[PDB]
């Protein structure tokens, strides 16, 4: 409480772009890379390094740090909304505790926020509820499918047929 003579808005603006090299996957054409570049507008394979951690993108005018997640539905069972028990370790590290670290390092809030954009709805619904359970208030999850995917065809189906259900009601 107090908040005056603000010298540095958006501390993550003092980060830098760099090649990831997290023993990930290379090639510029995979769905993982193309989806990341569309969410972050970062040229592959560059990401954002600030506060000792890796971030997929950084919307400086909004002071929001971005992270994109493409192919992860194959570790969940579709109809039940739970992960496959054999994939708990991969879900924990890649999706859950990595977002917990993102929330802890994205400070102060305001103005530093962090968003996680999921290509797949099934992955979004699980993770977003997990973040609410962990109380990551400065972290927002979105189902943001890319044009050209079959996930995008399902998204515009319901956002064009929700204006037929939220109108006659």
């Amino acid at each position: 409480q107090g908040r005056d003579k603000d010298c540095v808005e958006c501390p993550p603006s003092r980060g830098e772009m760099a090649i990831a090299n997290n023993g990930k996957g290379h090639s510029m054409s995979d769905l993982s890379a193309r989806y990341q570049q569309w969410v972050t507008n970062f040229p592959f394979p560059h990401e954002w390094f600030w506060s000792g951690t890796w971030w997929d993108g950084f919307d400086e005018p909004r002071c929001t740090l971005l992270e994109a997640k493409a192919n992860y539905a194959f570790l969940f069972v579709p109809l039940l909304g739970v992960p496959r028990p054999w994939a708990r370790a991969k879900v924990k590290s890649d999706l859950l505790q990595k977002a917990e670290v993102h929330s802890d390092k994205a400070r102060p809030t305001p103005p530093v926020f962090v968003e996680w954009h999921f290509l797949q709805r099934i992955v979004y619904e699980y993770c977003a509820a997990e973040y609410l359970r962990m109380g990551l208030a400065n972290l927002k999850a979105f189902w943001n499918p890319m044009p050209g995917t079959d996930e995008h065809d399902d998204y515009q189906e319901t956002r064009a047929k929700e204006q037929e259900e939220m109108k006659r009601f």
Partner: protein, 235 residues
């Protein structure tokens, strides 16, 4: 089948949970899986997780306990540990369930969780008797247990009584003794000596659609906070 997602996390004291090295850490998990086996055949064998189902079925750690150390990853700098195992059963409907044990420096990540606890509902004959059995387990092997709770996923995430802090759920453990009349009618107290009591909210499994089961846990957590027992959500 039409099952429901359920949460089963138990929080432990993050300050002195880190004091355990990788030796005593493995022994408590070992004593916990030994406790889990006599409850259902699906809890008899546990495996290492993997990036593929083919990979996650390669290391039976119940048959070969020497590979239990391979599950526990430890950071030397922060002295945090984590250990993830799973049932070996692929289908959550048939009892498939993983075990997530992490002891980080923060109270939010010093927990043991069974994911997803709704799989145990599709297989336990008497769920209340079997669910408290693994409660009283956890608390015997881990004296640092600060809190526990079992509740559905839709209830905590969306319909929790107080959103700023945790809940008692269907069955939870509060680290203190409680009075019986401070709670609703059919909420059963089993006072364990030394570490608190365990609170059961009706021996039948909670249903978030029944207004009764809603009010029992609701009117509960109102009491639990009246005495200063409900801990915050963030630590």
């Amino acid at each position: 089948k039409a099952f429901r997602r359920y949460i089963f996390e138990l929080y432990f004291d993050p300050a002195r949970l880190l004091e355990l090295d990788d030796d005593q850490h493995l022994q408590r998990i070992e004593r916990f899986l030994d406790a889990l086996a006599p409850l259902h055949p699906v809890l008899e064998n546990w495996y290492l997780c993997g990036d593929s189902l083919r990979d996650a079925l390669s290391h039976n750690v119940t048959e070969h306990r020497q590979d239990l150390a391979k599950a526990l990853s430890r950071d030397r700098r922060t002295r945090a540990v984590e250990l993830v195992l799973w049932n070996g059963e692929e289908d959550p409907l048939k009892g498939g369930l993983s075990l997530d044990y992490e002891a980080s420096g923060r109270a939010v990540s010093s927990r043991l969780q069974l994911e997803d606890a709704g799989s145990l509902l599709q297989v336990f004959d008497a769920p209340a008797s079997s669910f408290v059995a693994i409660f009283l387990a956890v608390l015997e092997i881990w004296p640092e247990t600060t809190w526990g709770m079992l509740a559905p996923h839709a209830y905590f995430v969306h319909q929790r009584t107080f959103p700023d802090r945790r809940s008692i759920g269907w069955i939870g453990f509060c680290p203190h003794p409680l009075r019986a009349t401070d709670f609703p009618a059919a909420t059963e107290l089993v006072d364990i000596p030394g570490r608190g009591t365990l609170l059961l909210n009706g021996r039948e499994p909670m249903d978030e659609t029944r207004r009764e089961h809603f009010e029992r846990v609701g009117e509960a957590d109102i009491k639990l906070m009246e005495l200063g027992y409900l801990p915050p959500l963030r630590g």
